[PDB]
């Protein structure tokens with residue numbers, strides 16, 4: 563049985579960096595990269611459209627992202643990794659953050675209307691009632707950084723289309739992560755996530771001085787599942 567762990571965090575919190583550290587350690591540990599992570603630079607063409615007109619493309623973008631996520635995560639469960647006896651699969655984000663952080667935020671910002679938002683939820687619920695068992699998480703790693711840490715890391719990473727991201731937006735996604743993963747006050751449609759263990763890592767400092775302590779904490783955490 564492959565342990566499934568998602569890595570969660572705000573934009574440019576350091577998910578990729580963290581995944582880069584994790585994917586280096588051993589045979590038994592493998593990462594499932596995030597669709598929207600890959601797009602960022604054919605279908606992933608929805609990204610360019612989102613850059614121009616988010617009110618137009620949000621529903622299409624989130625729908626495609628989540629379906630891409632679901633297939634890649636399902637795909638990945640079928641190694642040639644199904645062994646041996648402590649295989650771990652790391653998910654870059656999850657179907658939950660897709661919905662309760664991102665799609666959710668896009669509706670609150672009026673980039674999806676009531677109808678788009680109802681359809682998306684209807685669609686999301688169904689999908690996960692059809693594959694929830696397969697993709698159920700054994701753990702969540704929360705990469706905790708401040709909105710300002712994230713704003714600065716957006717700047718450093720250099721994507722020209724990301725340079726207009728306001729801090730208020732990062733603050734919103736921050737509240738939602740805190741609310742879901744630290745305070746566990748955000749209620750979802752998936753009651754098994756109320757039990758799911760959560761490792762919260764402060765990633766505000768430079769990863770280069772920290773990645774060792776970080777891995778140490780992850781192993782510690784994995785062994786307790």
Ligand SMILES: O=C(CN1CCN(c2cc(-c3cc4ccccc4s3)ncn2)CC1)N1CCCC1
Pocket residue numbers: 609612613616617667668671672673731
């Ligand atoms: O009413 C709106 C529409 N709007 C809400 C805030 N915005 C956003 C954009 C995004 C995104 C833009 C984008 C682009 C690529 C991939 C993911 C994303 S998510 N997410 C939340 N709010 C910009 C557009 N506006 C208020 C600020 C500018 C226009």
Ligand SMILES: O=C(CN1CCN(c2cc(-c3cc4ccccc4s3)ncn2)CC1)N1CCCC1
Pocket residue numbers: 573598624627655659660664723724726727728731
């Ligand atoms: O869309 C994302 C992640 N993501 C959101 C932030 N991104 C953005 C956001 C924005 C903006 C957010 C925002 C908010 C207010 C006003 C203008 C803007 S522009 N612009 C470009 N890329 C791309 C990556 N995901 C979809 C599913 C899981 C991750």
